[PDB]
Design a protein around this ligand. Sequence first.
Ligand SMILES: N[C@@H](CCC(=O)N[C@@H](CS)C(=O)NCC(=O)O)C(=O)O
Ligand SMILES: N[C@@H](CCC(=O)N[C@@H](CS)C(=O)NCC(=O)O)C(=O)O
Lengths: 226, 226
Amino acid sequence: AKPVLYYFNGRGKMESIRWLLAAAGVEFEEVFLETREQYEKLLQSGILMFQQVPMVEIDGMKLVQTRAILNYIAGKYNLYGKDLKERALIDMYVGGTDDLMGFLLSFPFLSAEDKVKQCAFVVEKATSRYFPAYEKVLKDHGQDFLVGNRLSWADIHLLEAILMVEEKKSDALSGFPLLQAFKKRISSIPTIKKFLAPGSKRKPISDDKYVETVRRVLRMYYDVKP
Amino acid sequence: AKPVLYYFNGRGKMESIRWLLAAAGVEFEEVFLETREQYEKLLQSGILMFQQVPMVEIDGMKLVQTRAILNYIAGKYNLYGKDLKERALIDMYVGGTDDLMGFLLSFPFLSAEDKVKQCAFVVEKATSRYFPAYEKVLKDHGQDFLVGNRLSWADIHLLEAILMVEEKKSDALSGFPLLQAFKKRISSIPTIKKFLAPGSKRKPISDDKYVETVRRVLRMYYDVKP
Ligand SMILES: N[C@@H](CCC(=O)N[C@@H](CS)C(=O)NCC(=O)O)C(=O)O
Ligand SMILES: N[C@@H](CCC(=O)N[C@@H](CS)C(=O)NCC(=O)O)C(=O)O
């Protein structure tokens, strides 16, 4: 049966999972949490090991913990390298883009003033720390992909991160020619091109409606700081 | 050559790595960051992909990102299950204890008042969310170990987490009989017993000296909130 993604109708921590499944050409279904009662019913069913989402029903498992879910999908669909060392490189690269996109998780919950500050913080991290690191990886081996000269989860996570940064600062990739070429190549891969196309399950930049729903369902995150 | 752990002379994010290596019976060396100049020299050498530590020199790699390092060690020393699904369970369990211990990372940098609040926050999470979840895993299959009826990284991460919670609230495991038995069994495993014994490389609860050193080296974390 198709994987079922339990989360809010928005990006959050589930977006990277949507990306990986789409990139692997895997059709999935989604169950959106829209009300407090719906969440309480979930808690009572005990299907959320730690009372939290993301949660993905896949291959008989009720998998929680974002990274555990991604690790599983990457491995199942051969996007995790060919051995222990390649997986280590993929994990190291993913850790970097996970931190980068992680700095944007609170963004929609921030005040107008903090959004400006956070945006500057994220762009600075991208241009001074992360983009230089990945540009160097590509420059050092000169291959089209980050690891093993073939598409991996690391490439998919980086493309998503690059797009999120560009949504905040359109010219953020300026000065990183290899990443620019990388962006075009990965975006053209059939499964990925389809995901970036209209009508896909890719979610938009989070808005006030998303925040309102998260707060209504979880009764939390009422005062987020940068 | 033996793995080399680059970090501060204290727990932080490197402690779990020390635990896993010790549990696997692997002898390692440590390089402690004590001065700003030492850190600047590291940055200039480019050995830290994202300008941060933990960093572990192992099998020819300059591995950064805590989870990437742990994933590698767990896999290399057969403490990651026997297949994709067992790894998924291990990752899900580890995610929970990583979050739990993660809530304690800022603790030594907190004010006296915030430490009291944070301690209450952590204990509540342990008794209402995490301990119940792991107690249930053990209860459901009745085996001595969390996954595959053999020692895994998940068991090691949970034991460490249990001990950290008990350091904050000694009777926190009360009401969780299976976890109590689990604590005694895992603590008795030769490699682990040795790590818990005097003279090991296990690090103590972080103190003001640790905080002072982190702030001196990184010139950051000057005002941490709960
Ligand atoms: N470490 C978990 C964290 C999950 C998490 O923080 N989930 C939030 C929603 S984005 C949640 O369920 N919050 C409710 C709560 O913690 O009580 C992961 O990576 O999946
Ligand atoms: N996601 C990274 C985070 C590493 C991290 O936050 N490292 C801190 C020390 S505990 C650091 O190097 N901070 C300096 C900085 O970020 O500039 C990991 O899990 O290893």
